[PDB]
Design a protein around this ligand. Structure first.
Ligand SMILES: [Ca+2]
Ligand SMILES: [Cl-]
Lengths: 179, 179, 179
């Protein structure tokens, strides 16, 4: 019917123009997606680098924290041991040592010197030591005339006195106050 | 004008061929974007897993570091307390205790034993103790003939001597050197 | 040849229909990619925030761990110093001080008081001190009749005895047991 071909060609041109416009817009979108996907991949790659670095610093930190925890626990136990075992300057309850003690120069009680270096130059007394009955209020009769028994009593008490002096000397030497 | 339809159909074919080529290239690009976007999403998902894990290890580390900081500070204060309060083996300035002290076996001064266990077996002296005037250069007259006053002087000095011995014994017992 | 134009227009319509279908599917894919790329970018942005935060917490942790390591090492050296230098309550080997020692109230050996505060009220003895030869088994002859030499011997031994008592008193005063 003569006219269809012009109508058909015209409408095909309309559809061709529509397709042309749609391809252009698709091309615009895909070209812009290209940039965006390229950018996203680059950022993801960069993100993996810093996270990998972070992972490398975390496991190292965890190692150090575990090592530190071990050294504090040891220190805490050494401190506990020292606290139970050390001699205090400020404690008021009597403190006792399981060992001998040596110090320089002096021992003191209440700020006054009571004990010091061993005193030397002694020649040790000989004979009997008297640690028995001793009456320092023992007195003596003295007559107007010579009495043997009265002189004997004086001599006897002089002997018990000298033997008491030796006994005391023995105690100082055995302690070590004198040589 | 007869010829236009062939010219029109030919140019439409040219445009159809152009569209065909452009759809192909778009299809190539979108198909390749599909893979890339799929890959990026998978990587992002995987990145969130490890970061979430990292966050889980950081806040735990921060907890442990804060706990460790607390235990060192306590330890540092215990150390400070021990340093101020402990008795030193190497310190040269005199050190003083606020408490009684007991040790095993001996006390010593300068490497020599000066004091030890209490000496036992003593029977305590009785009578007067003499801590007053005492002249150890006190001498005595002795005549060719018996003289009461001369014997009395000897006896008197024997008494003051025995009372001085008792006084000294009192001091050792009160300290505790003897029982 | 009359018929080609209808055949040509028909096949162009077929190709137009094919292009139309392909543009639709491309449009579907690109529209869906748009959402996905938008979502991926948003997630990447959000990932960078938390990683940046994580980086901010890691370098701070590394700072604290390094600071803690420094404080434990110092503490460990203070502990070592205390262990070598402190006086132990439980050690059995004799312990020695380089300094004088003062304590409250008493010194004790084996649980018994042996030493205490300085004894006062003494008037210092005068004269000769005897730290030489001393025989406490020295005895004396006593006749039925007055004998000057026998009385002299008693007096002489009384003098050496009093001088020995002074010698002992000197030792206690020099140590500090008495004033
Ligand atoms: Ca046509
Ligand atoms: Cl993407």
């Amino acid at each position: 019917g003569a006219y269809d071909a012009q109508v058909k060609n015209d409408e095909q041109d309309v559809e061709l123009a529509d397709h042309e416009a749609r391809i252009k817009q698709l091309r615009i979108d895909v070209d812009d997606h290209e940039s965006r996907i390229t950018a996203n991949t680059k950022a993801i790659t960069a993100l993996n680098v810093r996270v990998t670095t972070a992972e490398g610093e975390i496991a190292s930190l965890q190692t150090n924290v575990s090592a530190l925890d071990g050294r504090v626990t040891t220190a805490e136990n050494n401190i506990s041991a020292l606290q139970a075992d050390y001699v205090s300057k400020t404690a008021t309850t009597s403190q006792s040592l399981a060992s001998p003690l040596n110090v320089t120069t002096s021992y003191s009680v209440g700020g006054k010197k009571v004990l010091g270096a061993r005193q030397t130059g002694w020649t040790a007394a000989t004979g009997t030591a008297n640690k028995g009955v001793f009456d320092a209020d023992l007195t003596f009769a003295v007559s107007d005339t010579y009495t043997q028994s009265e002189i004997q009593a004086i001599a006897n008490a002089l002997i018990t006195e000298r033997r008491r002096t030796k006994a005391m000397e023995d105690a100082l030497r055995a302690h070590g106050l004198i040589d």
